[PDB]
Amino acid sequence: RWCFRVCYRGICYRKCRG
C-alpha cells in the first residue's frame, strides 16, 4: 500500500510495497 518516490541522480520513480 505504501507508495514512495525514490529519487536518485534526478530520476524519480515510485515504488509500492503493498
Distance, in Å, from the CA atom of 4 to the CA atom of 2, rounded to the nearest integer, reads 6
Q: CB within 8 A of 16, min separation 6: which ones?
A: 1, 2, 3, 4
| Determination technique for this entry | NMR
Using the Cα atoms of residue 3, residue 6, residue 11 and residue 12 in order, give the sign of their dihedral: positive
Residue-wise DSSP of the chain: -EEEEEEETTEEEEEEE-
C-alpha distances out from residue 18 to 2, 10, 11, Å? 6, 25, 22
Q: Are 16 and 2 in contact (CB under 8 A)?
A: yes
Q: Which residues pair with residue 4 across a beta bridge?
A: 15
Q: Which three cell numbers stand for residue 9?
A: 541522480
Q: What is the bridge-based pairing of β-strands 2-8 and 11-17?
A: antiparallel
Burial zone of 7 (CB within 10 Å; 0-12 exposed, 13-18 middle, 19+ buried):
exposed
